[PDB]
Copies of this chain bind each other. A is one copy, B any other.
Amino acid sequence: PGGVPWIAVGDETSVTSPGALRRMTSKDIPETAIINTDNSSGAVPSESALVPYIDEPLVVVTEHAITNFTKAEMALEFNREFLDKMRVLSVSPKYSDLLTYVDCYVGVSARQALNNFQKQVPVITPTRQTMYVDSIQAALKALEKWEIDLRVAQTLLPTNVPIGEVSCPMQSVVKLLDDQLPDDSLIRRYPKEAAVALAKRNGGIQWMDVSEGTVMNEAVNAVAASALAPSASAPPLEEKSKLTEQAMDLVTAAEPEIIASLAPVPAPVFAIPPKPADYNVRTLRIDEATWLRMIPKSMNTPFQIQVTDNTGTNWHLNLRGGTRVVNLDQIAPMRFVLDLGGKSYKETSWDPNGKKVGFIVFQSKIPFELWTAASQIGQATVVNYVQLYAEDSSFTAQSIIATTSLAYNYEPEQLNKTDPEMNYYLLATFIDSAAITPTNMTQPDVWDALLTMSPLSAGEVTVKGAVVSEVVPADLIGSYTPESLNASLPNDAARCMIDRASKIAEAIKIDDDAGPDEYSPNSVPIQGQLAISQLETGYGVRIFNPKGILSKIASRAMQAFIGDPSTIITQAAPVLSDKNNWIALAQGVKTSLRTKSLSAGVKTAVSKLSSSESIQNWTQGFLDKVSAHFPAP
C-alpha cells in the first residue's frame, strides 16, 4: 500500500469518524531510530556524542520501490572485484534490512486510512532512505574510470553479431587488445578482474579453470538477451514492441480530435510554436496580400513632410504615388526585420552612401489612399533607423547596399485601441536632416528588400490576414491556393494544420512498407468513403468504378498525403479536398495502430534477416583478418 501509517487515538472508529487518527512516529517503534540500525556499511558514527536523538516521522515503501532499488543494487554488483580492490563498501547493501514491518491503518489522508487496515506493512524513516541512496551513489562515483575503460575494451573490436555465430582464437584477440589498449587503461593494470567482469556481461567470452580444465557459460543476463536476439523468420521482439510504442506516441502527440473537429475550437487550444517567414513587398500583389495598402499611382504630385522621433529630432520625408504600407491592425504582436543587402537604389542625383533608412508609424483616421496633403497624416513617429553604406558589386559600374538589419516590434498592447475610427500604418523610407527634393529621389520607398516576419504571441491565430478568436479545422480542408498560401502571415491556421498533420504522416510511415498501388491497413478508409459516396445522389454525371480501381485511387491518395502533407489544405486536390476523406483517415489511424499484436510486414522481416546475414558474414571476415595477423603461437 501507499501513503503513511496512522495509529488510533480515540476508541471510536467509523469510515468518517471525526478526529480518530494520529500520525505514527518513531517514538512508537524503537527499531526505526538511527541509534538502532545496523552499520554493516559504516555510516552512523560509533561515538555516542555523534549520534543524535530527535524524533522522526515514518513513510511506507511501495513494492515498485523495493523492486527498482534492488535493481539499483544489481547495477553495482557487476563490478564487485574492482570495488574490492578499492576497499569500498565491503558488505553489499541489502534494502530489506532497513525496513520495519508493522500492521496499522495505511493511507495518504485520515479519511482514506479509516477504511484501510493492512498487516506486514513495511515502513522506513527518511534518514535511513537517504543513507541507503547515498551509499549507492558513492559506490557509483567510485567506478567511473573503470566503467569507461571496460566499455572501451568491449567496443574496440566486434563483440556482438546481429545473427548466427562467429569465432576467433582468444589468444589473437588478447594480442590485438594488448597492441591497441590505451596506456592509462585500468585493463592493463588489473587484467584478471577485467576478464571476470567481461565474462559476467557477455556469454561469448569464456574462461577455463586451469585447476580442473572446464569451460562453460557464466553470463547472468540470459533472460533479457533472449528477448534481444532475433529468432528465425522474425525480427527481435523488443524492436517490434518499441517501434509500435513510438508510433502510438507520435499519434497521441497531435490530438486527432482537434485537427478533425467539425465545430469551432479556441485559438489557444489549436496553436503551436510557429516559425519565421520571409517576404518581399514590391514583388507582392495588393489583391492577394490582404495586409498591404498602396496610394493609387495616378497621384503624380509627391509631398514632403516632417516627423519627430521619441527624442525630439525632426526628420524630412517624401510620399508619392505607389508608396506602400503594411496595415498593422487585426494582427497579433509581430516582429519585423528589414534587410537591404544586395540592392543599389542609385539615381542620377542620389547616392546611397551615407543615407538613412528607417521605420515610421502613422496613426490617422483618414484612410491611406485618400492621402493628398501633409496634415492628413495625423500622428507619426520614427521608431528606428539605420545608416547605409555601399560597396562595389560584381556588375560593372554598379554598387550594392551592404547588409543591414533593422528591427521593429509591433505590440498592440502598448497602443490604445479604444477609438475604432483609427488606422495604424507602417512605412520604411529614406530620411534626411534637410529637405529631400522630389526631383532628386524617384523611389516610393525602400520596401524592395528582404522582410522577415516572426510572431510574438503563440496564443493568437490569423486566417487570410485577419485575427480570428475561434477556428473550425474541418473547413480549412481544400480552401487554400498557393497564391493565397505563400502570402499568408507566419501564424496562419494553414501552417498549424500542416505541422500538426506532419506527425500523423510520420506515424503512418513508420508502420507501413507498401509499394506503389498496394492496399494497406491505413489506405482502406478512403476507399470505403469513396465507395459509399459514388452511390449517393448528386447533380453531375454519375460514374461507377469497380473495387480494384478504388483501392488504387485510395493508395495513391494516401501516398500523396505522406509525401506532401500540405496537399490536404490545397484547392482542387485530387482526393484530399473532400473533408470526409480527411476525417476518415484521421480517425482510422488510431484504430489501425491500436490493434497491432507484435507484428511487422513481410518485406521488413525478409529484409531484416538478409541484412543480419550480411553483417554476420562481414564480422566473420574481419575476425579472420584479425587472426591472420597477431597469430596464436
Contact = CB atoms under 8 A, between A and B. Distances in A.
Interface string A393-430: 11110001111110100010100000000000000000
Contacts of A516: 413, 457, 459-460
A248 to B, nearest CB: 9
A462 interface: no
Contacts of A619: 587
Contact of A519 (B2, B94, B152, B604): B152
A437 interface: no
A72 B154 contact: no
A343 interface: yes
Given A322-B392, A456-B563, A611-B257, A144 B602 contact: yes
Contacts of A438: none
A482 B547 contact: no
A342 B280 contact: yes
27 contacts: A55-B216, A57-B216, A57-B217, A76-B597, A126-B203, A140-B234, A140-B598, A140-B599, A141-B234, A148-B601, A150-B595, A154-B592, A154-B595, A156-B527, A180-B547, A246-B253, A257-B608, A266-B515, A283-B400, A333-B560, A346-B395, A394-B443, A405-B483, A413-B516, A458-B562, A459-B516, A583-B618
Contacts of A225: 126
Given A130-B226, A233-B137, A595-B150, A590 B506 contact: no
Interface stretch (A305-313, A353-361, A529-537): A529-537
The 7 lowest CB-CB distance pairs between A and B, nearest first, are A137-B231, A261-B611, A405-B482, A80-B109, A77-B108, A262-B614, A151-B521
Given A109-B80, A134-B231, A155 B588 contact: yes
B591 A155 contact: yes
Given A346-B396, A395-B344, A126 B222 contact: yes
Interface centre among A74, A116, A225, A268 (most CB of B within 10 A): A268
A391 B80 contact: no
Interface centre among A70, A143, A597 (most CB of B within 10 A): A597
Interface in A478-509: 481-483, 485-487, 491, 502, 505-506, 509
Interface stretch (A43-51, A235-243, A372-380): A235-243
